[PDB]
Amino acid sequence: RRDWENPGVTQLNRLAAHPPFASWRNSEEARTDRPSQQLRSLNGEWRFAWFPAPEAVPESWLECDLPEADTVVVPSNWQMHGYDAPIYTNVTYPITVNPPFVPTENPTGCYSLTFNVDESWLQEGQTRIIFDGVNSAFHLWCNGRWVGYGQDSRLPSEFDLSAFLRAGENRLAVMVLRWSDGSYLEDQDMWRMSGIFRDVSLLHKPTTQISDFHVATRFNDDFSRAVLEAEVQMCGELRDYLRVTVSLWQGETQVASGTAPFGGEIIDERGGYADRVTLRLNVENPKLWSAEIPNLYRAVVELHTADGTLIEAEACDVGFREVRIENGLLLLNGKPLLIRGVNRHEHHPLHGQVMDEQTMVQDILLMKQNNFNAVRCSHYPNHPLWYTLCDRYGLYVVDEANIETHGMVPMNRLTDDPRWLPAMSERVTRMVQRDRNHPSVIIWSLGNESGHGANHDALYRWIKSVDPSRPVQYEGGGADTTATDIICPMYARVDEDQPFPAVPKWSIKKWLSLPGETRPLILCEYAHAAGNSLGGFAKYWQAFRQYPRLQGGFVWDWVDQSLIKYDENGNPWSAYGGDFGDTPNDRQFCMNGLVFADRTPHPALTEAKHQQQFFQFRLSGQTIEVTSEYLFRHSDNELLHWMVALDGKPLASGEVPLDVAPQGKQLIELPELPQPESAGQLWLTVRVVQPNATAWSEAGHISAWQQWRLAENLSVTLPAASHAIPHLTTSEMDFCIELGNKRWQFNRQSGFLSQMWIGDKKQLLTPLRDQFTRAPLDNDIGVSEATRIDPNAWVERWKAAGHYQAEAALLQCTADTLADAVLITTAHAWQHQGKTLFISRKTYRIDGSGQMAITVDVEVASDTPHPARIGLNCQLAQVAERVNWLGLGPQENYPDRLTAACFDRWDLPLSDMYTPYVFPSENGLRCGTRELNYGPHQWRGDFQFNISRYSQQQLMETSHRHLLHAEEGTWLNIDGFHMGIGGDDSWSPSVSAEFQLSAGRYHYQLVWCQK
Amino acid sequence: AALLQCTADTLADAVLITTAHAWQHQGKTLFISRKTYRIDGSGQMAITVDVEVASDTPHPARIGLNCQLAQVAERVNWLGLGPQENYPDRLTAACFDRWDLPLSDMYTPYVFPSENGLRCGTRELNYGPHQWRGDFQFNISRYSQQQLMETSHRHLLHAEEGTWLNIDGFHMGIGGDDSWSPSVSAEFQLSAGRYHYQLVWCQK
Ligand SMILES: O=C1O[C@H](CO)[C@H](O)[C@H](O)[C@H]1O
Ligand SMILES: [Mg+2]
Ligand SMILES: [Mg+2]
Ligand code: NA
Ligand code: NA
Ligand code: NA
Ligand code: NA
Ligand code: NA
């Protein structure tokens, strides 16, 4: 019947969806959430065999293990074991678009397991098997007998095996299909894999059982009083002696308990539900749940007899919180939320899409440590443990249905088709039935990029009807359709409108006030962190803080989707689209995370942490005003450390305890600061430190910081006259300046300083020349599809203008001797096919003190695309271990992404001055630098710089970081100016006007000398 | 202005004058101006100005040069934004072109006297035998900035001997969102800390 090519059949013999069950036969264990003997894991070693199509599977496999099969670990994606290649494609379906058909060559994975089952499980009750995740469709057999079928890769499929099992040894046989009609609803921009990638278990339930239960919590006006309501449903034979007891616990203290026989209130003309009962428990002064303080209670649902015999128990963590939209604002416990969130895919560099507790916890810790309080399940229901962790650690979750049909034309072709309503409804309804009891889930999502169809409006209302406790959102069709309670655009800009036809992305500030609009606005996706990105991030947060209805958003995204591969030497390297022979593919577009696949931070993470701080500061005189953005907690684990320094040198510091109420302010007056010893700029730096450790952080964790320029004393003291005078040696091909053991050689043909000698040691490997280009960042290249070549992308404009090909032409090179120095004057014109792109005029002044002052004045043709940078570069013959500088740091920072950086004296090993982006590009820059020290060299002025063993040329021509090779010496790039990196999105020019080098005329001056 | 440095150097085809000043008050150095005047064999004086402004002093109204020329001409010819008065935050209406107006039109008769008549984005200015080139803002009239701020009514102003010229590399916005509180937007305040501008003064 080829059930995998029929959207009308999404499952066969599958049991109803429901909340997590464990079937405890001991209440104490249900209360403490301890392991349950009635819930067995079948994870471990299984037998697996790969076939090109389901037609190639031998019938023998159904009742006997195939000798050709291997023993593999489950859960797992078979591509990760090497049976076939994982495919990375963004929008374009990996299969021919011809719904509901899939290729005849359909990779088939045949799993089998021989396991034991005790007669005690078969003599009484029900024994069911549970597959938390199978990609993307499968048929189940038990002891050679066909059991059922299932679809939807991100929700569990359960089947009753009570009639197929036998005492002793049993054998399962699962035929998993890579492609099915369900694949048409799973076109998310991520690796395309398959297999039994989530847990498999066996659950025993009594015949008379708790089949479902819903927990709700409503409050009075000030939340000082609450009522917990628990509806419980049963299956089996109804008896007058059956009872249901629901008890609520706060730690070891039982707070409330209620018992009642089955039989619900009258529903309609035919009566009520005799197989259901609702318990209502009163709770005074409940400890409220929030991401700030994840207070949790434990609800225990007991099914028992009047005489006191327990039949079974279920339970869940309960969080007392209310979520509602009122007067245009998303409120939590009556307070307007400010969503500091991020999108997070279930990705592991080695295991693929198999999630483990360790990785989940690591992500959560890093998230909260970096001031995030929310996560969006892009774009499907997550591993069940995820919700438990967000419940306990405290993170707001947007639970999203596994529905994305991005590759359709138009996007809503399937979702506006009633023939697909069934398949869609199951992805939404089964998600709600599974996760509705988790307090962490505060918003439901109908899926992602499936345009907007009538099926969306239908399912939108279904959720509103069955679960009024959570708002529903969906971005397809314009981000503001009738299928969403929240305006949730993706990559809508802060001030700039993008009037696309039919589905415009208005600037978020303008979106809010459109005629008749009243809903709150939270971007489901923004600040695309692909590579060297997050430029302009601060602009979003200034807006979020000023506009009440702009309530944040979810950064895209958390972690790069790179996979581990091994080279000839067997060493691991990070791969992306196309590295597995997968084609078509969208290359590096799968890496858009704030952290690398191994969870190592990208520089952008710190910019995020800074902007998302929960404490805001203002300086007036010597008074620091600290405002709290927390909505529920007082700052009872915060200490403010302040430090004043004169250009890096510490002059004074202290620490004051913070005691600010949520939404409150605290005034802190700094003691009279001693007068700076010399000239320079005083800088005030304050940091909020958490003295005590928490569930998500260690003692001494820094949660917020800010800097301010205080008094400055301009140096009016002119240096002493030098002893010796530099000597000029004019030759036909060179202008050589001599001063003691030092020598500067300027080539008269090129007009560039080609070499420097300190004694007999050459200082340069490459001449000091102007540079107006950079190894293009992901945002410069701007393609979300490898097949598309955007001529409007910055890199194409630069290439087309000849910026990368431009040749310097000497216009002038003269030398002059002054009273105490030698003045070299130069002028170069950079041209491309007759067009003069840039003109650089310089003067080099080498005085008796051995300093070479370099003054640069550049002209940029107003009609050529604004240059990526304006500076100089050279290859220093030396390679030192450290880099020391006075400026912004310690991490990499660009013009539109430097708010998190602080002005101070920084010292790091040379390696840290290079950011290992998987896709190489310009990186490691540090801005606002007044002094740079490397080996014997020292550069002064006001510039931006990067330094490493990789020339811009190699970075630009190398596709993977692991293929880079340390060049001889050290490449230095010092820019008087540098263009912004952008990032609002990575498929169109995103660098804001203020960060484009459009001034036409630029001036900067550097001083090069010996340290 | 406290003189920090004043030197002279003879080059191949030019004389170089280097200077450094520090404007202070109550022992506080407010600004520091470093310049070089390069007069070559063609009679052109290239002036390069680099100024430092203490970060803790209120941003200055302008960063430029001024002098009182002895000559009094009838016309003012310039290549820049015009023909009317325009300031950094009020120049969208002005157009770049060759403008030529009588001296009187370069003065805006506000009843209450103040800085007036500025014209921005000027690459060339001509007055009498003089010509200034670069990329500056300027106002030119028979009234000094001093007289303007000391005189309450326009009818009390008296033409001073010669002509007062104010060539600025940078000028603060004029604001106006209201007239009873600071209203000059941030992007129009001279807060860069270090400013650079150059001019070429010659005869025509
Ligand atoms: O709009 C989007 O942008 C991202 C680009 O990396 C990613 O494809 C998301 O899944 C999609 O919703
Ligand atoms: Mg089907
Ligand atoms: Mg997509
Ligand atoms: Na807001
Ligand atoms: Na992507
Ligand atoms: Na505190
Ligand atoms: Na590259
Ligand atoms: Na006046």
mmCIF file of N, CA, C and O and ligand atoms in Angstrom, chain A residues 88-90 189-190 345 491 525 528 530 556-557 561 586 588-593 784 987, ligand 5:
data_model
loop_
_atom_site.group_PDB
_atom_site.id
_atom_site.type_symbol
_atom_site.label_atom_id
_atom_site.label_comp_id
_atom_site.label_asym_id
_atom_site.label_seq_id
_atom_site.Cartn_x
_atom_site.Cartn_y
_atom_site.Cartn_z
ATOM 1 N N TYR A 88 22.844 18.368 3.357
ATOM 2 C CA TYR A 88 22.525 19.696 3.862
ATOM 3 C C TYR A 88 21.988 20.614 2.770
ATOM 4 O O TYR A 88 22.718 21.036 1.872
ATOM 5 N N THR A 89 20.700 20.918 2.858
ATOM 6 C CA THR A 89 20.064 21.809 1.906
ATOM 7 C C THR A 89 19.159 22.714 2.727
ATOM 8 O O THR A 89 18.555 22.282 3.714
ATOM 9 N N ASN A 90 19.107 23.981 2.337
ATOM 10 C CA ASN A 90 18.310 24.977 3.038
ATOM 11 C C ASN A 90 16.821 24.952 2.660
ATOM 12 O O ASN A 90 16.003 24.380 3.385
ATOM 13 N N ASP A 189 15.645 24.050 7.451
ATOM 14 C CA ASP A 189 17.008 24.344 7.012
ATOM 15 C C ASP A 189 18.014 23.725 7.980
ATOM 16 O O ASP A 189 18.481 24.364 8.923
ATOM 17 N N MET A 190 18.337 22.463 7.734
ATOM 18 C CA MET A 190 19.254 21.718 8.590
ATOM 19 C C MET A 190 19.682 20.447 7.873
ATOM 20 O O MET A 190 19.183 20.140 6.792
ATOM 21 N N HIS A 345 18.556 24.304 17.557
ATOM 22 C CA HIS A 345 18.307 23.037 16.895
ATOM 23 C C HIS A 345 18.937 21.962 17.761
ATOM 24 O O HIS A 345 19.811 22.260 18.575
ATOM 25 N N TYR A 491 14.033 38.534 11.047
ATOM 26 C CA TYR A 491 14.964 39.477 10.447
ATOM 27 C C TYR A 491 14.342 40.799 10.001
ATOM 28 O O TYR A 491 14.825 41.433 9.067
ATOM 29 N N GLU A 525 12.930 35.152 14.928
ATOM 30 C CA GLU A 525 14.308 35.030 14.439
ATOM 31 C C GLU A 525 14.890 36.402 14.110
ATOM 32 O O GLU A 525 14.224 37.225 13.479
ATOM 33 N N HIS A 528 21.055 37.323 12.611
ATOM 34 C CA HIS A 528 21.639 36.114 12.049
ATOM 35 C C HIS A 528 23.144 36.073 12.348
ATOM 36 O O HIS A 528 23.933 36.849 11.802
ATOM 37 N N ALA A 530 25.675 34.230 11.488
ATOM 38 C CA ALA A 530 26.509 33.425 10.601
ATOM 39 C C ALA A 530 27.916 33.989 10.522
ATOM 40 O O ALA A 530 28.127 35.085 9.994
ATOM 41 N N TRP A 556 19.098 34.001 15.812
ATOM 42 C CA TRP A 556 19.296 32.817 14.996
ATOM 43 C C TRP A 556 20.786 32.665 14.683
ATOM 44 O O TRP A 556 21.342 33.454 13.929
ATOM 45 N N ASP A 557 21.439 31.678 15.294
ATOM 46 C CA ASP A 557 20.803 30.765 16.233
ATOM 47 C C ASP A 557 21.855 30.336 17.250
ATOM 48 O O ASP A 557 22.910 30.953 17.332
ATOM 49 N N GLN A 561 25.832 24.086 12.779
ATOM 50 C CA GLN A 561 25.461 22.716 12.450
ATOM 51 C C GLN A 561 26.590 22.075 11.646
ATOM 52 O O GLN A 561 26.364 21.525 10.570
ATOM 53 N N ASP A 586 23.732 23.466 0.402
ATOM 54 C CA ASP A 586 23.907 24.894 0.596
ATOM 55 C C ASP A 586 25.122 25.313 1.418
ATOM 56 O O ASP A 586 25.099 26.315 2.133
ATOM 57 N N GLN A 588 28.117 26.351 3.657
ATOM 58 C CA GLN A 588 28.278 26.854 5.017
ATOM 59 C C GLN A 588 27.047 27.510 5.636
ATOM 60 O O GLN A 588 27.103 27.986 6.770
ATOM 61 N N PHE A 589 25.933 27.528 4.918
ATOM 62 C CA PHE A 589 24.746 28.160 5.465
ATOM 63 C C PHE A 589 24.153 27.435 6.671
ATOM 64 O O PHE A 589 23.231 27.946 7.308
ATOM 65 N N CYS A 590 24.683 26.255 6.986
ATOM 66 C CA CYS A 590 24.201 25.484 8.131
ATOM 67 C C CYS A 590 24.890 25.912 9.438
ATOM 68 O O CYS A 590 24.547 25.429 10.518
ATOM 69 N N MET A 591 25.862 26.814 9.332
ATOM 70 C CA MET A 591 26.593 27.302 10.501
ATOM 71 C C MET A 591 26.224 28.759 10.787
ATOM 72 O O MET A 591 26.809 29.678 10.221
ATOM 73 N N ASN A 592 25.250 28.970 11.668
ATOM 74 C CA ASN A 592 24.816 30.328 11.996
ATOM 75 C C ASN A 592 24.785 30.527 13.512
ATOM 76 O O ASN A 592 24.122 31.441 14.001
ATOM 77 N N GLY A 593 25.507 29.685 14.249
ATOM 78 C CA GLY A 593 25.487 29.771 15.702
ATOM 79 C C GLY A 593 26.356 30.777 16.442
ATOM 80 O O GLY A 593 27.338 31.298 15.911
ATOM 81 N N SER A 784 22.059 32.517 0.977
ATOM 82 C CA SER A 784 21.406 31.508 1.797
ATOM 83 C C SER A 784 21.237 30.286 0.908
ATOM 84 O O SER A 784 20.714 29.257 1.337
ATOM 85 N N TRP A 987 21.697 37.330 3.716
ATOM 86 C CA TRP A 987 21.403 37.106 2.308
ATOM 87 C C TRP A 987 21.050 38.387 1.552
ATOM 88 O O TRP A 987 20.438 38.349 0.484
HETATM 89 NA NA NA C 5 20.925 28.466 7.960
#
